[PDB]
Scaffold this active site. Structure first.
Site, PDB file in Angstrom:
ATOM      1  N   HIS A 197     -54.808 -23.734  15.767  1.00  0.00           N
ATOM      2  CA  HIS A 197     -55.768 -23.304  16.767  1.00  0.00           C
ATOM      3  C   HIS A 197     -55.589 -21.843  17.122  1.00  0.00           C
ATOM      4  O   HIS A 197     -56.580 -21.142  17.339  1.00  0.00           O
ATOM      5  CB  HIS A 197     -55.631 -24.144  18.032  1.00  0.00           C
ATOM      6  CG  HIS A 197     -55.623 -25.618  17.777  1.00  0.00           C
ATOM      7  ND1 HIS A 197     -56.743 -26.315  17.370  1.00  0.00           N
ATOM      8  CD2 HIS A 197     -54.628 -26.529  17.886  1.00  0.00           C
ATOM      9  CE1 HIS A 197     -56.439 -27.593  17.237  1.00  0.00           C
ATOM     10  NE2 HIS A 197     -55.165 -27.751  17.549  1.00  0.00           N
ATOM     11  N   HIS A 252     -49.957 -16.019  22.990  1.00  0.00           N
ATOM     12  CA  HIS A 252     -50.875 -16.222  21.903  1.00  0.00           C
ATOM     13  C   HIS A 252     -52.124 -15.437  22.237  1.00  0.00           C
ATOM     14  O   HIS A 252     -52.243 -14.859  23.323  1.00  0.00           O
ATOM     15  CB  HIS A 252     -51.216 -17.696  21.710  1.00  0.00           C
ATOM     16  CG  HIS A 252     -51.862 -18.308  22.909  1.00  0.00           C
ATOM     17  ND1 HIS A 252     -51.136 -18.938  23.904  1.00  0.00           N
ATOM     18  CD2 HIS A 252     -53.162 -18.355  23.301  1.00  0.00           C
ATOM     19  CE1 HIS A 252     -51.966 -19.351  24.845  1.00  0.00           C
ATOM     20  NE2 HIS A 252     -53.197 -19.016  24.503  1.00  0.00           N
ATOM     21  N   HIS A 273     -56.656 -15.231  21.614  1.00  0.00           N
ATOM     22  CA  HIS A 273     -57.941 -15.767  21.199  1.00  0.00           C
ATOM     23  C   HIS A 273     -58.769 -14.590  20.719  1.00  0.00           C
ATOM     24  O   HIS A 273     -58.714 -13.522  21.326  1.00  0.00           O
ATOM     25  CB  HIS A 273     -58.656 -16.454  22.362  1.00  0.00           C
ATOM     26  CG  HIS A 273     -57.831 -17.506  23.027  1.00  0.00           C
ATOM     27  ND1 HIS A 273     -57.930 -18.838  22.692  1.00  0.00           N
ATOM     28  CD2 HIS A 273     -56.859 -17.419  23.970  1.00  0.00           C
ATOM     29  CE1 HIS A 273     -57.065 -19.529  23.418  1.00  0.00           C
ATOM     30  NE2 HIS A 273     -56.399 -18.693  24.192  1.00  0.00           N
ATOM     31  N   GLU A 330     -61.885 -15.054  26.207  1.00  0.00           N
ATOM     32  CA  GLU A 330     -62.195 -16.270  26.948  1.00  0.00           C
ATOM     33  C   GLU A 330     -62.780 -15.900  28.313  1.00  0.00           C
ATOM     34  O   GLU A 330     -63.936 -16.224  28.610  1.00  0.00           O
ATOM     35  CB  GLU A 330     -60.925 -17.119  27.055  1.00  0.00           C
ATOM     36  CG  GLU A 330     -60.453 -17.547  25.680  1.00  0.00           C
ATOM     37  CD  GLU A 330     -59.707 -18.856  25.683  1.00  0.00           C
ATOM     38  OE1 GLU A 330     -58.750 -18.973  26.461  1.00  0.00           O
ATOM     39  OE2 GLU A 330     -60.101 -19.756  24.909  1.00  0.00           O
ATOM     40  N   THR A 357     -57.172 -24.779  26.310  1.00  0.00           N
ATOM     41  CA  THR A 357     -57.254 -25.699  25.185  1.00  0.00           C
ATOM     42  C   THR A 357     -56.822 -27.055  25.674  1.00  0.00           C
ATOM     43  O   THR A 357     -56.074 -27.169  26.656  1.00  0.00           O
ATOM     44  CB  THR A 357     -56.370 -25.307  23.986  1.00  0.00           C
ATOM     45  OG1 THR A 357     -54.990 -25.234  24.365  1.00  0.00           O
ATOM     46  CG2 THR A 357     -56.792 -24.000  23.415  1.00  0.00           C
TER      47      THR A 357
END
Ligand SMILES: O=C(O)c1cccnc1
Ligand SMILES: [Zn+2]
Length: 257
Positions: free
Chosen positions: A61, A91, A93, A103, A196
Site C-alpha cells: 500500500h 511513510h 502517499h 491526502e 488506511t
C-alpha cells in the site's frame, strides 16, 4: 482486500471497515480561512536526535521506514499533545501526476505527496494498544511539492529499488528523519483517524503549514514501486491516497496567524 483500485479503493472500504463513515475520519480539507488560531497551542517539540531507524518495507500500500520505539529515542511532544509520543514509522502517499497525491488538501489544493510520521502515546505501552485509544496516536503530516530536491530524502529514494514489490524489506539504519522537515513547524491540528484500514479514530493530526520541496526525479522513483508482489501482475504503486472526508463536528485549529 482493500487497496486503491477501481474495485477495492476508498469508496469500497466502508464495507469491511464501517468506521470509514465515522465522525472523525481523515484526511480532511483544511480550509485556511475557517481554521482558528489558538494562541494557547504550544510549540511543537520534535526530538529526533536519537532516532534509530531499522528498516524499510513495501507493504503493498506504501513503504514504511520503521524505527526502534522501545525507548524514547525519537519523540513528539507539546503542540496540542499531552504526554510523549514515540515515532514508530513514517511513510508517504503520492500521485501518478504532480497535481495530486496528498491526502489532506489546503483550500482544496492537492500536493504531489504527503509524508506521515506516525507516533504513539507512551502511556499506552505499545502501538497496538494505542490505536484503540482516542488520543493514542499523533501523526505529523508534511506536504511535498515538486521543485528542488530534498537531500534528506535521497537515501530513501535510493533504497526503493530493493523493495520494489509487496513484502520486500531492506535494512535501513542510521536514517535521520530531521532531514525531511521544513524550516517552520507552524501547524494545523484536528482529531481524526488512520487514513488506511482499519481507519481507527485514534489520531491527533498535526499538519505542517510549510511543504517540503522534492525533485521530479525523487517523486518519479516513488512511482516505480509496485503494489503487487514479485511474480504477480505489475501494478504501479501510485495514487495511494485517500480523498478528503467530511469534517463533521470538528474544528481545525492553527498554531499561527
Ligand atoms: O493509516 C496509517 O497511517 C496506518 C494504518 C495502520 C497502521 N499504521 C498506520
Ligand atoms: Zn499515511
Amino acid at each position: 482486500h482493500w487497496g486503491y483500485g477501481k474495485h477495492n479503493g476508498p469508496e469500497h472500504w466502508h464495507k469491511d471497515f464501517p468506521i470509514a463513515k465515522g465522525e472523525r475520519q481523515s484526511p480532511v480539507d483544511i480550509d485556511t480561512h475557517t481554521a482558528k488560531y489558538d494562541p494557547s497551542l504550544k510549540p511543537l517539540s520534535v526530538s529526533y536526535d536519537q532516532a534509530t531507524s531499522l528498516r524499510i518495507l513495501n507493504n503493498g500500500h506504501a513503504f514504511n521506514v520503521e524505527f526502534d520505539d522501545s525507548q524514547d529515542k525519537a519523540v513528539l511532544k507539546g503542540g496540542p499533545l499531552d504526554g510523549t509520543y514515540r515515532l514508530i514509522q513514517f511513510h508517504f502517499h503520492w500521485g501518478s501526476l504532480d497535481g495530486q497525491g496528498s491526502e489532506h488538501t489546503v483550500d482544496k489544493k492537492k500536493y504531489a505527496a504527503e509524508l506521515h510520521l506516525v507516533h504513539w502515546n507512551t502511556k499506552y505501552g505499545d502501538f497496538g494498544k494505542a490505536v484503540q485509544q482516542p488520543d493514542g496516536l499523533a501523526v505529523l503530516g508534511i506536504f511535498l511539492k515538486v521543485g528542488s530536491a530534498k537531500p534528506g530524502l535521497q537515501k530513501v529514494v535510493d533504497v526503493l529499488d530493493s523493495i520494489k514489490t509487496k513484502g520486500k524489506s531492506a535494512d535501513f539504519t542510521n536514517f535521520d528523519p530531521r532531514g525531511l522537515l521544513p524550516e517552520s513547524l507552524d501547524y494545523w491540528t484536528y482529531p481524526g483517524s488512520l487514513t488506511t484500514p482499519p481507519l481507527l479514530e485514534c489520531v491527533t493530526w498535526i499538519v505542517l503549514k510549510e511543504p517540503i520541496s522534492v525533485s521530479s526525479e525523487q517523486v518519479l522513483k516513488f512511482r516505480k514501486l509496485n503494489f503487487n508482489g514479485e511474480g504477480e501482475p505489475e501494478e504501479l504503486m501510485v495514487d495511494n491516497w485517500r480523498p478528503a472526508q467530511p469534517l463533521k463536528n470538528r474544528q481545525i485549529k492553527a498554531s499561527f496567524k
